[PDB]
């Protein structure tokens, strides 16, 4: 069984949330799996959701396709998307995200570096 690394909620705006989950498979110490999960507890759907991510060049990032681009209102089906990070040199993980989507007929563009990444995700 893999180490139990706590989830990290990284974003909340008008009922839309983004959460990170982390898995460090013991059989491959250089690998970190991050699953992003977008949820929506507001009264309006999220559409055209795209999450872009960047890591320091000391690390490698791979993005899987997301489960979808819509998060229905009132706790609808979440979007999940897998990030594969390879970090053999145990460099400090830094992660910058760019979220773009439509919500309440507004174009949303949010960009930020993720703070409070658990050290277990890279040590």
């Amino acid at each position: 069984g893999s180490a139990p690394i706590p989830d990290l909620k990284v974003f909340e705006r008008e009922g839309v949330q983004l959460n990170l989950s982390f898995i460090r498979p013991p059989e491959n110490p250089a690998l970190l799996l991050i699953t992003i999960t977008a949820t929506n507890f507001s009264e309006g759907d999220v559409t055209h959701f795209i999450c872009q991510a960047a890591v320091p060049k000391s690390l490698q990032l791979q993005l899987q396709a997301p489960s979808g681009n819509t998060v229905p209102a009132r706790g609808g089906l979440p979007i999940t998307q897998l990030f594969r990070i390879l970090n053999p040199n145990k460099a400090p993980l830094r992660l910058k995200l760019r979220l773009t989507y439509d919500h309440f007929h507004q174009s949303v563009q949010e960009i930020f570096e993720v703070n409070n990444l658990p050290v277990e995700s890279w040590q």
Partner: peptide
Amino acid sequence: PDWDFN
């Protein structure tokens, strides 16, 4: 170490 948005 530099980054990139793809």
